[PDB]
């Protein structure tokens, strides 16, 4: 179905697997030392079928003046930023 | 449907009608529709005081009556229609008014509380049945994969995009369609994806011809293609034009059913191949690749027919035909040789719960050489490779074993292992319920389970493989503290290799076993096993063109030792909220 | 002495009647014997009152007559005796799930070959379309009249279903439809009291 | 008595007529003689498979061209739709009345189906409908007694 | 009065019976007392959501096991099929007759539904049908007065 | 016209000439719009004359009236009428 | 609303005012919820007056009562009502 955009939705990762929440949400304001200007709720994700064990994060601002974003931590230390 | 003629032909016919052995007793206010999105048609009863259904199973049996958990009072309302408005692949219940729609989402066990969706702006929706001079229907005319609300009249076609959850966008005019407007009769308007593409075309029937307007990707219609009717046939209000892929070609054929004192039918084939597929490649350096496709329903009919000859009852687990690659041909110019790969597929399946195709449980590949004329007296025989794969539906996966080549002295075959990560151990687990069995078995999909290689020569041992490879997979549960599905991980725990070289006796055989692995799937403990030679059976099964006593002279003691290579290992893992590095090797013994 | 009777329907497949005959009575597959009897201009199948045969009238020699003994249908065993001893037919409808199109006709006569409290003209029914076909232009169970076959005891006598112009050698009109007849279904309504 | 023609009336010259002899239908032969000799028509409906628009009607008259006990007004029948179209707004075999054509022997006489305003040169209203007409089907109900 | 058993009659030992107490259905509590105290059954139909073979029927008798104004022949109802099967060939609420079970108080007595030839080690005809019968449904029409 | 599942139309059909109209057959209501007869039940056998019955097929005038049609005054038919494509009469008549 | 597999509707429609309500035309029971005229068989020509017949269209009040609605009492209709989107009255009336 068409998403509701109300956090009842699920997400697909780099490969179209369903992501699940792995990590209880935590707060953060600084990404790699960069003060993003807002506190974000950061939720960790895993694929339902865990291929290559990458780790994903969803960053959700607690404000309205900022957008969300995703991070991916690859097994080789490679870090990706999506949708910023 | 039945295969007509020999297996491998592409002809389709139908068998003598027979009573179904079992049908529902309740056939009052019922209809045959899919309401769960399973692929199984449901005889759905919505009568005075009773709501439920009988689902038709793939083996021909029916389920017992299943009550609906919830059905809308309006289900039976005169303007009620079923359509996918949620965009979920399910048919939702909806009533359309000019300014709003009443939508009851299909929740796959009954329906959701109805919601009234008010349309935005000044959008006014057509209401089907409101005006006899035009057709209103739900169809995909944009090629987006969603039915849109479409109005067709003599002078124009107007589409209102389906934005989901009952929301419609502004009308779009799709130019190019036009009828005389005095002679226009919606009864004569048929819709179909005749070219096998995204959007649906528009066919207008005239008494002596079919006026076909191709859909130019939702941006209007192509100039009409006029197909004359065969002589003696004329279309009228008693005649039916049907559009269906009766031939499994991936595209509908046009069927004219005319009951004029003696029903007779005609069918127009527009293509025998699905248009928009890659067909050729030429690299301009002499290599030319030709692809061909064959639908899964034709492979099914061949499978079905083969079963008849052995008295077996096959079951097709794939209601949704797909086009698979078949007869890939590579022509080497300059050289003049041709290489042909033929694929055969069997036992494929549709999931039905996640609404996805799982894959084929069996793929058979031939490999044939057509050497340039004048090069050889038909040297280089074709090869055959049989591959069995998990579908993750253990009605198929379990059956696949009977198709394996039999070696009476073989090692025991494999079955999947399921585990749970318990106190960091790979602890065996038998799934607690059906939901876990589902989630675990699907994690096996696509895994090669077995591979056999044969040469297709003219010898006496042509029925013995050169090689056999077997695999054992494992699915580990890592996290189930979530929505119902678990986080699963899988890999091959064991792999066994046999080398027969077409001699049924005395094969070589070895096996790789991962005894233990880390939380990130690293091979903490591995073992390689080299099995001993079997102790010289009475019957050689060798060519016997051999030197005297050679076979006796081929046996030795080293061949009888069991070797186990055992390796321990360890890795570092940098895991924190800021760093992720996995698998850095540390040590091994 | 009036009584609302139990109103009971029963469906009879003739294919299962002939197929189910004791071996000594010549059991047979109906569709197959019909095909042979249509292709030949004569012959018969079965025995006794459970058979197929060509008729022996002066204008019926080219017809096929399907015969069924009511006694052998064991209708009376479907419900317990204690519900009533009188078990009589109220109405019989014939279904011929043939490939008979909406613009095609079948000519067949259903009749009772025995002594019973029949009304005059109720001894025989015409079947013309084969779809729950009562030989009436309209069916009304409350029009004040007796229906075809009404009152016949459920275990007595024999029915015949006759298809004229069946013989293929005579170029009979039904000769080609009969070769495609899968079964004969009798829907029998009867009451108990 | 089995032909097509234009009419010869004063207001029917542009009407297209079709006719059929009952005697040539060989209805009687469908059932054995022994069932009874009196075989008479109970009712006739007409189907006109044709391609028509959504608000397009049919104008046709079915009539019996012979001597028979036609009731006053059962002599002729109108067709308006052509879909198993009886001559009545309601068809009831139990209203106490004789139906159109009721009592005509199945062997005797000729029916004519007349389509007015058929000639194309006269711009007849049915001129375009007739050209989309593929057949004429009669549904004859009759009784044997 | 809420059970399953085989019948005790001489010709019922192979009949499977089901019985239900009206008193335990609590029909009476669906509507408030103020709307009327006399609550009587007008009509009962039986629905049987089972699977059947090619041309198989369903044999069942519905009857009232208590003292009531049961007219002659309104004592019991025969079921031939499961499609909201009333006790007649036609159901007519206005033919001037009382219907089966009509006038029985909604909370009194017991109904029994009897399936003859139910026993499997006897080869009863209904023995197989019953193994495809997931539920038994009574649709009850009653009035408040 | 585009009416929803629970939306009616209000219109009166009447004969504007001298004819032997029965009292009450002078005018007909329209409420649903789909082959809508001037009555809750239609029966040609109830012993009564139908609306407009007996009017010569070639004389006089019919009028169909939609109350509350004006848009500036916010009428109710006013929004529906903008979606009315045509008006269709179904005339059953007899030749004697 | 939505109903469970064997669920029915229990509702009473009644007129809360002074009017010529015939004996038994004072109130109507609803059972299926779909154009549910609370009659086992509806006939507009059986010679009888129908429920609520004769009440002026602009006089008095209707009440629709759903028994066993209160959720704390675990009323049987309580869960039906939670799914009820609307209430629709189809009113036939005549002008004379």
Q: Are E43 and E141 spatial neighbours (Cβ–Cβ below 8 Å)?
A: yes
Cα distance between residue B296 and residue B248, in whole Å: 8
Residues in chain A: 84
Q: Identify the helix (H) or strand (E) that includes residue B174.
A: strand B172-174
Distance of CA C169 to the CA centre of its chain: 25
Q: Are B194 and B215 spatial neighbours (Cβ–Cβ below 8 Å)?
A: no
Contacts C85 to E, Cβ<8 Å = none
Cα distance between residue B551 and residue D82, in whole Å: 90
Strands C64-69 and C87-95: unpaired
Q: Where are the alpha helices (DSSP H) in D29-144?
A: 127-130
CB atoms within 10 A of CB E3: 11
CB atoms within 10 A of CB B55: 19
Cα dihedral: D130, D132, D134, D135 (round 10): -30
Matching residue, tokens 């046999």? B498
Strands G62-65 and G11-15: antiparallel
Q: Are E120 and E129 spatial neighbours (Cβ–Cβ below 8 Å)?
A: no
Chain A residues with a Cβ under 8 Å from any Cβ in chain B: 1-2, 18, 20-22, 26, 32, 42, 46-50, 53-55, 73-77, 79
The secondary structure of B47-87 as a DSSP string is ETTEEEEEEBPTTS-BPPPEE-S-EEGGGGSTT-EEE--SS
Residue G47 main-chain phi, psi, to 5 deg: 85, 5
Q: Are E3 and E19 spatial neighbours (Cβ–Cβ below 8 Å)?
A: yes
**Environment class of C129 (CB within 10 Å of its CB; exposed 0-12, middle 13-18, buried 19+):** middle
B130 to F4: CB separation less than 8 angstroms, yes or no: no
For residues E20-43, one letter each, b for 16 or more C-beta atoms within 10 angstroms of the residue's C-beta and e for the rest, the string is bbbbebebbebbeeeeeeebbbbb
Interface membership of F87 toward B (CB under 8 Å): no
B185 to D54: CB separation less than 8 angstroms, yes or no: yes
Cα distance between residue B198 and residue B147, in whole Å: 11
Distance of CA B543 to the CA centre of its chain: 44
By C-alpha distance, the chain F residue nearest B100 is F4
**E-strand spans in chain F?**
11-15, 27-30, 62-65
Experimental method: cryo-EM
Tokens (6 digits) for B385: 């490779």
Cα distance between residue B348 and residue B359, in whole Å: 6
**Environment class of F87 (CB within 10 Å of its CB; exposed 0-12, middle 13-18, buried 19+):** exposed
Cα distance between residue G31 and residue G8, in whole Å: 6
Chain E residues with a Cβ under 8 Å from any Cβ in chain G: 29-32, 35, 42-43, 93-94, 137, 141, 144-145
The secondary structure of B427-471 as a DSSP string is EE---SSHHHHHHHHGGGTT-EEEEEEEE--SSTTTTS-SEEEEE
Report the largest interatomic distance among the alpha carbons of chain G, rounded to a whole angstrom.
Answer: 48
Cα distance between residue B302 and residue E74, in whole Å: 59
Distances (CA, A) of E19 to D7, E4, E77, E88, E138: 75, 6, 15, 22, 12
Q: Are B338 and B373 spatial neighbours (Cβ–Cβ below 8 Å)?
A: no
Judge E/C contact: 3 or more CB pairs < 8 A. Answer: yes
Tokens (6 digits) for E130: 């019953």
B124 to F7: CB separation less than 8 angstroms, yes or no: no
Q: Identify the residue among B52, B73, B117 best suited for mutation to test binding to G, counting G beta carbons within 10 A and taking the highest.
A: B73
Chains linked to G by 3 or more Cβ pairs within 8 Å: B, E, F
Under DSSP, is residue D40 helix (H, G, I), strand (E, B) or coil? strand
**E-strand spans in chain C?**
6-13, 44-47, 50-54, 64-69, 87-95, 108-112, 124-127, 158-163, 185-192
Q: Which of D55, D78, D90 sits opposite F44 (nearest CB)?
A: D90
B259 to C102: CB separation less than 8 angstroms, yes or no: yes
Which are the contacts of G78, defined by CB distance < 8 A and separation ≥ 6? G68, G69, G70, G71
Q: Please state the three-class secondary structure of chain A as a single string.
A: CCCCCCCCCCCECCCCCEEEEEEEEEEEEEECCEEEEEEEEEEEEEECECCCCCEEEEEEECCCCCCCEEEEECCECCEEEECC
Adjacent-strand bridge partners of B253: B244
Judge A/G contact: 3 or more CB pairs < 8 A. Answer: no
Q: Which long-range contacts (CB under 8 A, 24 or more apart) does F40-47 make?
A: F40/G44, F40/G92, F41/G44, F41/G45, F43/G45, F44/D89, F44/D90, F45/D90, F45/D95, F46/G45
Residue B360 main-chain phi, psi, to 5 deg: -90, 140
| Plot region of B143 (φ>0 → left; ψ -120 to 50 → alpha; else → beta) | left
For residues B150-166, one letter each, b for 16 or more C-beta atoms within 10 angstroms of the residue's C-beta and e for the rest, the string is bbbbbeebbbbbbebbb
Q: How far is G30 from chain B (nearest CA, A)?
A: 13
Q: Are B151 and B157 spatial neighbours (Cβ–Cβ below 8 Å)?
A: yes
Q: How far is E15 from chain G (nearest CA, A)?
A: 27
E78 to C7: CB separation less than 8 angstroms, yes or no: yes
Matching residue, tokens 């389920």? B63
Q: Which of C109, C138, C165 sits opposite D93 (nearest CB)?
A: C138
In the stretch 34-53 of chain G, residues with CB closer than 8 A to chain B read 34
Cα distance between residue G33 and residue C2, in whole Å: 39
Interface membership of F90 toward B (CB under 8 Å): no
Q: Which of B215, B165, B223 is nearest to B194 (CA)?
A: B215
Q: Are B138 and B81 spatial neighbours (Cβ–Cβ below 8 Å)?
A: yes
Q: How far is D50 from chain B (nearest CA, A)?
A: 5
Q: Are C7 and E76 spatial neighbours (Cβ–Cβ below 8 Å)?
A: no
Under DSSP, is residue C124 helix (H, G, I), strand (E, B) or coil? strand
Under DSSP, is residue C110 helix (H, G, I), strand (E, B) or coil? strand
Adjacent-strand bridge partners of C66: C52, C161
| Plot region of B196 (φ>0 → left; ψ -120 to 50 → alpha; else → beta) | left
Q: Identify the residue among C103, C124, C140 best suited for mutation to test binding to D, counting D beta carbons within 10 A and taking the highest.
A: C103
Q: After which residues is chain D broken (C to N over 2.5 A)?
A: none
Cα distance between residue C91 and residue D95, in whole Å: 23
**E-strand spans in chain D?**
4-6, 16-21, 39-47, 60-64, 76-79, 110-115, 137-144
Q: Are C159 and C186 spatial neighbours (Cβ–Cβ below 8 Å)?
A: yes
Which are the contacts of G16, defined by CB distance < 8 A and separation ≥ 6? G60, G61, G62, G63
Contacts G88 to F, Cβ<8 Å = 6
Q: Are B485 and A21 spatial neighbours (Cβ–Cβ below 8 Å)?
A: no
Q: Please state the three-class secondary structure of B214-282 as a single string.
A: CECCCCCECCCEEEECCCCCCCCCCCEEEEECCCCCCCCEEEEEECCCCCEEEEECCCCCCCCCCCEEE
DSSP letter for E120, please: T
E137 to G6: CB separation less than 8 angstroms, yes or no: yes
E48 to B48: CB separation less than 8 angstroms, yes or no: no
Q: Are B274 and B196 spatial neighbours (Cβ–Cβ below 8 Å)?
A: yes
Q: Are B178 and B236 spatial neighbours (Cβ–Cβ below 8 Å)?
A: no
Chain B residues with a Cβ under 8 Å from any Cβ in chain D: 132-133, 182-188, 206-207, 234-239, 260-261
Residue G44 main-chain phi, psi, to 5 deg: -85, -5
Q: Which of E61, E57, B254, B25 is nearest to C192 (CA)?
A: E61
Interface membership of F20 toward B (CB under 8 Å): no
Cα distance between residue F59 and residue B531, in whole Å: 107
Query: Rg for chain G (alpha carbons), in Å?
Result: 15
F3 to B127: CB separation less than 8 angstroms, yes or no: yes
Cα distance between residue B564 and residue B511, in whole Å: 10
Cα distance between residue B533 and residue B509, in whole Å: 8
Chains linked to F by 3 or more Cβ pairs within 8 Å: B, D, G
Sheet with F27-30: strands ordered across: F27-30, F11-15, F62-65
Q: Are F29 and G95 spatial neighbours (Cβ–Cβ below 8 Å)?
A: yes
Strands B467-479 and B417-422: parallel
Residue B323 main-chain phi, psi, to 5 deg: -100, 115
E52 to B28: CB separation less than 8 angstroms, yes or no: no
DSSP letter for B285, please: S
A77 to B164: CB separation less than 8 angstroms, yes or no: no
A20 to B483: CB separation less than 8 angstroms, yes or no: yes
Q: Which of D23, D73, D18 is nearest to D46 (CA)?
A: D18
B207 to D135: CB separation less than 8 angstroms, yes or no: no
A1 to B87: CB separation less than 8 angstroms, yes or no: yes
Cα distance between residue B118 and residue B122, in whole Å: 11
Contacts across the F-G interface (CB distance below 8 Å): 9
Q: Identify the residue among D46, D49, D56 best suited for mutation to test binding to B, counting B beta carbons within 10 A and taking the highest.
A: D49
Which are the contacts of B389, defined by CB distance < 8 A and separation ≥ 6? B359, B360, B361, B362, B363, B446, B447, B448, B449
Matching residue, tokens 């079947």? C127
Q: Which of C114, A50, F64 is nearest to B479 (CA)?
A: A50
Adjacent-strand bridge partners of C185: C13, C95
Cα distance between residue A46 and residue A13, in whole Å: 9
Interface membership of D127 toward B (CB under 8 Å): no
Cα distance between residue F59 and residue B509, in whole Å: 103
Cα distance between residue G85 and residue B131, in whole Å: 28
Q: Which of B83, B172, B174, B165 is nearest to B119 (CA)?
A: B165
Cα distance between residue E95 and residue E90, in whole Å: 10
Contacts G30 to B, Cβ<8 Å = none
Cα distance between residue D109 and residue D23, in whole Å: 7
Q: Are F30 and F40 spatial neighbours (Cβ–Cβ below 8 Å)?
A: no
Q: Are B509 and B496 spatial neighbours (Cβ–Cβ below 8 Å)?
A: yes
A48 to B489: CB separation less than 8 angstroms, yes or no: no
E31 to G27: CB separation less than 8 angstroms, yes or no: no
Sign of CA dihedral B425, B431, B433, B435: positive
Q: Are B26 and E47 spatial neighbours (Cβ–Cβ below 8 Å)?
A: yes
Adjacent-strand bridge partners of A51: none
DSSP letter for C176, please: H
Contacts D50 to B, Cβ<8 Å = 236-237
Cα distance between residue B295 and residue B300, in whole Å: 9
CA C135-C136-C139 angle, to 5 degrees, is 120
Cα distance between residue C105 and residue B145, in whole Å: 46
C103 to B259: CB separation less than 8 angstroms, yes or no: yes
Contacts B185 to D, Cβ<8 Å = 51-54
B76 to G34: CB separation less than 8 angstroms, yes or no: yes
Distance of CA G60 to the CA centre of its chain: 16
**HSE, side-chain direction, 13 A CA sphere, residue B255:** 14
Chain D residues with a Cβ under 8 Å from any Cβ in chain C: 29-35, 42-43, 93-94, 137, 141, 144-145
Strands G62-65 and B50-55: unpaired
Strands B383-389 and B448-455: antiparallel
Cα distance between residue C125 and residue D35, in whole Å: 11
Matching residue, tokens 């050698």? C169
Contacts F29 to G, Cβ<8 Å = 95
Cα distance between residue B303 and residue B349, in whole Å: 14
Residues in chain B: 589
**HSE, side-chain direction, 13 A CA sphere, residue B152:** 26
Contacts across the D-F interface (CB distance below 8 Å): 7
Matching residue, tokens 């001699």? B503
Cα distance between residue B19 and residue C14, in whole Å: 14
Q: How far is B111 from chain G (nearest CA, A)?
A: 8
Straight-line distance from the first to the last Cα atom of chain E, in angstroms, rounded to the nearest whole number: 27
Contacts E135 to B, Cβ<8 Å = 65
């Amino acid at each position: 179905g068409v998403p509701h955009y109300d956090e009842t939705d699920t997400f697909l990762g780099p490969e179209g697997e369903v992501l699940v929440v792995a990590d209880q949400p935590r707060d953060e304001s600084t990404l790699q030392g960069i003060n993003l200007g807002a506190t974000f709720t950061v939720t960790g994700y895993r694929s339902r079928l865990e291929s290559h064990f990458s780790r994903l994060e969803y960053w959700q601002p607690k404000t309205t003046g900022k957008t969300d974003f995703w991070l991916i931590y690859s097994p080789d230390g490679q870090v990706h930023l999506l949708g910023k | 449907a039945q295969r007509l003629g020999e297996i491998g032909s592409d002809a389709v016919t139908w068998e003598k009608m027979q009573p179904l052995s079992v049908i529902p007793s309740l056939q009052s206010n019922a209809s045959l529709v899919d309401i769960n999105g399973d692929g199984q048609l449901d005889w759905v009863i919505t009568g005075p005081g009773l709501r439920g259904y009988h689902s038709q199973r793939p083996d021909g049996s029916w389920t017992r009556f299943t009550p609906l958990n919830a059905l809308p009072v309006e289900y039976t309302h005169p303007r009620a229609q079923l359509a996918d408005l949620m965009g979920a692949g399910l048919s939702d219940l909806v009533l359309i008014g000019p300014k709003s729609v009443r939508l009851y989402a299909n929740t796959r066990d009954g329906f959701a509380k109805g919601k009234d969706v008010v349309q935005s702006g000044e959008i006014t929706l057509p209401v089907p049945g409101a005006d006899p001079r035009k057709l209103v229907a739900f169809s995909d005319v944009l090629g987006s994969g969603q039915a849109h609300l479409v109005e067709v009249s003599a002078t124009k076609v107007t589409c209102w995009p389906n934005l989901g959850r009952g929301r419609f966008g502004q009308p779009i005019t799709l130019p190019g369609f036009s009828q005389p407007a005095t002679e226009f009769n919606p009864a004569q308007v048929y819709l179909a994806d005749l070219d096998g593409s995204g959007p649906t075309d528009l066919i207008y029937v005239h008494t002596n011809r079919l006026d076909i307007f191709l859909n130019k990707s939702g941006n209007g219609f192509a100039e009409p293609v006029t197909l004359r009717f065969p002589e003696g046939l004329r279309f009228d209000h008693t005649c039916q034009l049907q559009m269906a892929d009766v031939q499994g070609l991936g595209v509908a054929s046009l069927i004219l059913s005319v009951p004029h004192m003696s029903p007779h039918h005609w069918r127009c084939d527009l293509t025998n191949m699905k248009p928009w597929l890659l067909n050729e490649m030429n690299n301009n350096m002499g290599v030319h690749h030709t692809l061909r496709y064959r639908s899964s329903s034709q492979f099914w009919l061949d499978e079905k027919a083969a079963a008849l000859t052995t008295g077996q009852t096959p079951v097709c687990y794939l209601p949704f035909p797909i086009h698979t690659l078949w007869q890939t041909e590579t022509e080497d110019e300059i050289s003049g040789n041709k290489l042909v790969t033929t694929l055969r597929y069997a036992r494929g399946a549709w999931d039905g719960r996640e609404r996805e195709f799982r894959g084929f449980g069996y793929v058979e590949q031939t490999d044939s050489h057509q050497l340039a004329q004048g090069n050889a007296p038909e040297r280089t025989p074709p090869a055959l490779t049989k591959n069995w794969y998990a579908t993750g539906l253990p009605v198929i996966d379990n059956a696949l074993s009977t198709e394996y080549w039999r070696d009476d002295q073989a090692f025991a075959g494999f079955s999947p292992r399921f585990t749970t990560w318990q106190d960091n151990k790979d602890v065996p687990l038998t799934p607690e319920d059906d939901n876990s069995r589902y989630w675990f078995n699907r994690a096996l999909k696509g895994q090669l389970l077995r591979s056999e290689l044969y040469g297709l020569d003219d010898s006496t041992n042509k029925h013995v493989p050169y090689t056999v490879t077997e695999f054992r997979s494992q699915v580990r549960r890592l996290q189930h503290t979530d929505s119902r599905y678990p986080v699963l991980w899988s890999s091959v725990v064991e792999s066994r290799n046999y080398h027969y070289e077409r001699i049924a006796s005395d094969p070589q055989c070895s096996q790789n076993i991962t005894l233990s692995s880390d939380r990130f799937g690293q091979p903490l403990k591995q073992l390689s096993v080299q099995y001993p030679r079997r102790q010289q059976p009475a019957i050689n099964l060798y060519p016997d063109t051999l030197p005297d006593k050679l076979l006796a002279n081929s046996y030795d003691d080293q061949q009888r030792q069991l070797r186990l290579t055992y390796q321990q290992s360890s890795w570092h893992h940098l895991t924190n909220n800021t760093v992720r590095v996995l698998g850095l090797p540390d040590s091994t013994r | 002495r009036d009584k609302r009777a139990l109103e009971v329907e029963r469906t009879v497949s003739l294919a299962e009647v002939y197929a189910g005959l004791p071996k000594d009575n010549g059991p047979f597959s109906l569709a197959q014997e019909i095909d042979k009897l249509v292709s030949q201009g004569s012959g018969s199948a079965g025995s006794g009152n459970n058979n197929l045969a060509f008729g022996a009238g002066t204008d019926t020699k080219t017809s096929l007559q399907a015969s069924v003994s009511f006694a052998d249908l064991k209708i009376r065993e479907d419900y317990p005796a204690s519900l009533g001893k009188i078990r009589r037919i109220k109405q019989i409808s014939v279904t011929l799930p043939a490939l008979l199109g909406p613009y095609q006709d079948v000519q067949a006569i259903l009749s009772y070959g025995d002594k019973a409290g029949l009304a005059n003209g109720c001894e025989a029914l015409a079947v013309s379309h084969g779809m729950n076909d009562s030989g009436q232009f309209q069916l009304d169970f409350n029009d004040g009249k007796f229906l075809p076959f009404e009152g016949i005891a459920i275990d007595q006598g024999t029915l015949t279903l006759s298809f004229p112009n069946a013989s293929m050698p005579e170029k009979g009109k039904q000769a080609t439809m009969l070769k495609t007849l899968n079964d004969i279904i009798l829907h029998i309504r009867y009451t108990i009291k």
